[PDB]
Design an enzyme around this catalytic site. Structure first.
Site, PDB file in Angstrom:
ATOM      1  N   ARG A  38       0.839  -1.188   0.000  1.00  0.00           N
ATOM      2  CA  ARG A  38       0.000   0.000   0.000  1.00  0.00           C
ATOM      3  C   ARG A  38       0.881   1.246   0.000  1.00  0.00           C
ATOM      4  O   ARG A  38       1.928   1.273   0.645  1.00  0.00           O
ATOM      5  CB  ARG A  38      -0.897  -0.051   1.245  1.00  0.00           C
ATOM      6  N   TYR A  40      -0.967  -4.474  -6.254  1.00  0.00           N
ATOM      7  CA  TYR A  40      -0.664  -5.037  -4.944  1.00  0.00           C
ATOM      8  C   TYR A  40      -1.746  -4.739  -3.915  1.00  0.00           C
ATOM      9  O   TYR A  40      -2.166  -3.580  -3.759  1.00  0.00           O
ATOM     10  CB  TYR A  40       0.668  -4.502  -4.416  1.00  0.00           C
ATOM     11  N   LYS A  70      -9.343  -2.167   1.781  1.00  0.00           N
ATOM     12  CA  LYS A  70      -9.102  -0.884   2.425  1.00  0.00           C
ATOM     13  C   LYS A  70      -9.911   0.236   1.778  1.00  0.00           C
ATOM     14  O   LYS A  70     -10.490   1.067   2.479  1.00  0.00           O
ATOM     15  CB  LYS A  70      -7.616  -0.559   2.376  1.00  0.00           C
ATOM     16  N   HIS A 130     -10.536  -0.486  11.554  1.00  0.00           N
ATOM     17  CA  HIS A 130      -9.381  -1.338  11.321  1.00  0.00           C
ATOM     18  C   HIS A 130      -9.181  -2.237  12.551  1.00  0.00           C
ATOM     19  O   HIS A 130      -8.233  -2.091  13.311  1.00  0.00           O
ATOM     20  CB  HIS A 130      -8.173  -0.443  11.083  1.00  0.00           C
ATOM     21  N   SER A 189      -1.140  -1.339  11.133  1.00  0.00           N
ATOM     22  CA  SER A 189      -0.532  -2.359  10.292  1.00  0.00           C
ATOM     23  C   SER A 189       0.804  -2.801  10.884  1.00  0.00           C
ATOM     24  O   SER A 189       1.541  -1.995  11.457  1.00  0.00           O
ATOM     25  CB  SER A 189      -0.362  -1.797   8.874  1.00  0.00           C
ATOM     26  N   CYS A 247       1.342  -4.611  13.539  1.00  0.00           N
ATOM     27  CA  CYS A 247       1.381  -4.507  14.997  1.00  0.00           C
ATOM     28  C   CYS A 247       0.641  -5.644  15.696  1.00  0.00           C
ATOM     29  O   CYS A 247       0.417  -5.575  16.914  1.00  0.00           O
ATOM     30  CB  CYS A 247       0.829  -3.145  15.435  1.00  0.00           C
ATOM     31  N   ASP A 272      -8.939  -7.966  10.519  1.00  0.00           N
ATOM     32  CA  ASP A 272      -8.490  -6.722   9.890  1.00  0.00           C
ATOM     33  C   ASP A 272      -9.537  -5.616   9.837  1.00  0.00           C
ATOM     34  O   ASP A 272      -9.200  -4.449  10.024  1.00  0.00           O
ATOM     35  CB  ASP A 272      -8.004  -6.985   8.455  1.00  0.00           C
ATOM     36  N   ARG A 307       2.801 -11.553   1.719  1.00  0.00           N
ATOM     37  CA  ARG A 307       1.484 -11.843   2.273  1.00  0.00           C
ATOM     38  C   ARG A 307       1.030 -13.229   1.871  1.00  0.00           C
ATOM     39  O   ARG A 307       1.407 -13.736   0.819  1.00  0.00           O
ATOM     40  CB  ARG A 307       0.418 -10.854   1.764  1.00  0.00           C
TER      41      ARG A 307
END
Ligand SMILES: Nc1nc2c(ncn2[C@@H]2O[C@H](COP(=O)(O)OP(=O)(O)OP(=O)(O)O)[C@@H](O)[C@H]2O)c(=O)[nH]1
Ligand SMILES: O=C(O)C(=O)CS(=O)(=O)O
Ligand SMILES: [Mn+2]
Ligand SMILES: [Mn+2]
Ligand SMILES: [Mn+2]
Length: 620
Positions: free
Chosen positions: A85, A233, A242, A262, A284, A286, A309, A403
């Site tokens: 991102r 991506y 998102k 989120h 992100s 974390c 997420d 990922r």
């Protein structure tokens, strides 16, 4: 109608029929086909046969490789310029800038990137005309949320990337049944192109089509449109995730009285047979996916995963905060995933999973930093750069943001209510990030307003999931800094307004820090499955146990309230130390940030909590 034969694209449809589409869907497809000039149009049906053929096509084109060690698993390697991102090329278009971000007092806004309609029209016209020449335009009908759920929303994504199609089949509910449910209803319009019309002017790296120089991810909430160019991506191209389910959705949630966040959603059951659901917002990189799929170390405790997420939440008629996971799979960070950090993920990803930018072993498997699993003699590793790799090389074998993309239904601990259309009732909300110093392992907010302030005040050391690097402490309120669909001041007011609702059963609000380090730079807390001991304390606090002590920053566990059996080496004084010097500086940084970045749109209740925290620290 037409005077020639230039507007009807029926002759180019290689799957489906434009005639069977709802009228507004047909117009969206055909109008963009006229603009982008694809060679073929493929209306996705979501079938297994379709998926099989798309995999075969991508394999024949060299876009993916089969991982022969596993059951129906595949590997894609990207251009090294298209690996994450990109916050700095992500924009929201509104008539007035204040609808998108608060007007800052002195600096540039960090809470969003606004672009005028006029500027976007110029950017759009420089990119999309003719951009799909020689490629197939895929039409992806998808539902965010279980089909028919009251919180479910339908989108149509047009894309020229079969990789996006396959990934959207995993990450959303996709295909013919969505079109039938949509009828003539409203949908979110999603337009995507890798930006590489044929014939290619530039050669491709790793057979990965992208246009980094022109990459632009745009949101037009008033038109319910998402328009993304140049990246293949993750969050840039899987537009349901998102772009739709946080950015567009948070604006809709503001308008319609709900929340799009989120957050992971988990259900936890204790040894007395009681079960509660919690949501947690971490930035992100974390640890949301580690927590959502946790294997608890404490006996008699069970964790089940609803989502990892994105959460959509709304109070019901009874006053319960109900949440759904709008996604259909997990798009999780691969490096660091091991039998010791996330064994339930290891079980999930061994079939029907697409991996992006991890390493391949010569026997057909996957590898990454932190996998913690030795390889047999003679097995060799190919890095994500398509090069032979040895542990003696400097660079990692897998990109840090590589990922896995895996179906949620395969997770061995997927919650039995994870597709229930009524959602699950949330009894606690957890905030947290990476704080190497100062911030204790866990505390509890003093009130709803204080808890909203705690979310607003979140900070976290810079990771590697956007384009930010280094060890800087940045602000990430609610873990939503890259994802606000609208003015953050109005978002705070929206959260605060939940306390005004009749019979609202507001959840308890907690803040955690798994990442506190000692003077040696060593983690004080083992984390991962051991975080079940913190969840146990939260569970009891939700039940009303007298297990907390008051501090200037909120409630913390009493001495001996935390089950620390099995880790006698834990420095509790350092883990829960509260230093006046640290917190005096912390409040000043929060003050400077809220004043500049939120300015005239800061709700008074948040300023009041800041003042109260400053006063409580001053009395230490
Ligand atoms: N010390 C410690 N590190 C943790 C813990 N849980 C997760 N991590 C770290 O978190 C990192 C992986 O987090 P990510 O998968 O990237 O986080 P995420 O929130 O799921 O990210 P996104 O999917 O991008 O939203 C690894 O560096 C882990 O070591 C924990 O309990 N303790
Ligand atoms: O960055 C994040 O929080 C993600 O979940 C990965 S992406 O979907 O944004 O690529
Ligand atoms: Mn070919
Ligand atoms: Mn994750
Ligand atoms: Mn995320």
């Amino acid at each position: 109608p037409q005077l020639h034969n230039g507007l009807d694209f029926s002759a180019k449809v290689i799957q489906g029929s434009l005639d069977s589409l709802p009228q507004e869907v047909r117009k969206f497809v055909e109008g963009n086909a006229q603009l982008c000039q694809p060679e073929y149009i493929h209306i996705c049906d979501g079938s297994e046969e379709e998926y099989g053929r798309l995999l075969a096509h991508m394999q024949e084109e060299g876009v993916i490789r089969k991982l022969k060690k596993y059951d129906n698993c595949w590997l894609a390697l990207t251009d090294p310029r298209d690996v994450a991102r990109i916050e700095s090329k992500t924009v929201i278009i509104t008539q007035e800038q204040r609808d998108t971000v608060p007007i800052p007092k002195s600096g540039q806004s960090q809470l969003g990137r606004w672009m005028s309609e006029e500027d976007f029209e110029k950017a759009f016209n420089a990119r999309f005309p003719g951009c799909m020449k020689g490629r197939t335009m895929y039409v992806i009908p998808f539902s965010m949320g279980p089909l028919g759920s009251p919180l479910a929303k339908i989108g149509i994504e047009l894309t020229d990337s079969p990789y996006v199609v396959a990934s959207m089949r995993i990450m959303t509910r996709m295909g013919t049944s969505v079109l039938e449910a949509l009828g003539d209803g409203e949908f979110i319009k999603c337009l995507h192109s890798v930006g590489c019309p044929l014939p290619l002017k530039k050669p491709l790296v790793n057979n990965w089509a992208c246009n980094p120089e022109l990459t632009l991810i745009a949101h037009l909430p008033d038109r319910r449109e998402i328009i993304s160019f140049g990246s293949g991506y993750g969050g840039n191209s899987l537009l349901g995730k998102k772009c739709f389910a946080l950015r567009i959705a948070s604006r809709l949630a503001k308008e319609e009285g709900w929340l799009a966040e989120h957050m992971l959603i988990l259900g936890i059951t204790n040894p007395e047979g009681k079960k509660k659901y919690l949501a947690a917002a971490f930035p992100s990189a974390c640890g949301k996916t580690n927590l959502a799929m946790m294997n608890p170390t404490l006996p008699g405790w069970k964790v089940e995963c609803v989502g990892d997420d994105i959460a959509w939440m709304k109070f019901d008629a009874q006053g319960n905060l109900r949440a759904i996971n709008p996604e259909n799979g997990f798009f999780g960070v691969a490096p660091g995933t091991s039998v010791k950090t996330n064994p339930n993920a290891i079980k999930t990803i061994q079939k029907n999973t697409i991996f992006t930018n991890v390493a391949e072993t010569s026997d057909g498997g996957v590898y990454w930093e932190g996998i913690d699993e030795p390889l047999a003699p003679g097995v060799t590793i190919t890095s994500w750069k398509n090069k032979e790799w040895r542990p003696q090389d400097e660079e990692p074998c897998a990109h840090p943001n590589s990922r896995f993309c895996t179906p949620a239904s395969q997770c061995p601990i997927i919650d039995p209510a994870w597709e229930s259309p009524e959602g699950v009732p949330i009894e606690g909300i957890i905030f947290g990030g990476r704080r190497p110093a100062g911030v204790p392992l866990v505390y509890e907010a003093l009130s709803w307003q204080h808890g909203v302030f705690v979310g607003a005040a979140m900070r976290s050391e810079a990771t590697a999931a956007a384009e930010h690097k280094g060890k800087v402490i940045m602000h990430d309120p609610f873990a939503m800094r890259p994802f606000f669909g609208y003015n953050f001041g109005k978002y705070l007011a929206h959260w605060l307004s939940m306390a005004h609702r009749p019979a609202a059963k507001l959840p308890k609000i907690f803040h955690v820090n798994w990442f506190r380090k000692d003077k040696n730079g060593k983690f004080l807390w083992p984390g991962f499955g051991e975080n079940s001991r913190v969840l146990e304390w939260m569970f009891g606090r939700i039940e009303g146990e007298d297990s907390a002590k008051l501090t200037p920053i909120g409630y913390v566990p009493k001495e001996d309230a935390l089950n620390l059996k099995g880790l006698g080496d834990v420095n509790v004084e350092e883990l829960f130390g509260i230093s006046k010097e640290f917190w005096e500086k912390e409040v000043e940084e929060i003050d400077k940030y809220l004043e500049d970045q939120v300015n005239a749109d800061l709700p008074y209740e948040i300023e009041r909590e800041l003042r109260a925290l400053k006063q409580r620290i001053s009395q230490m």
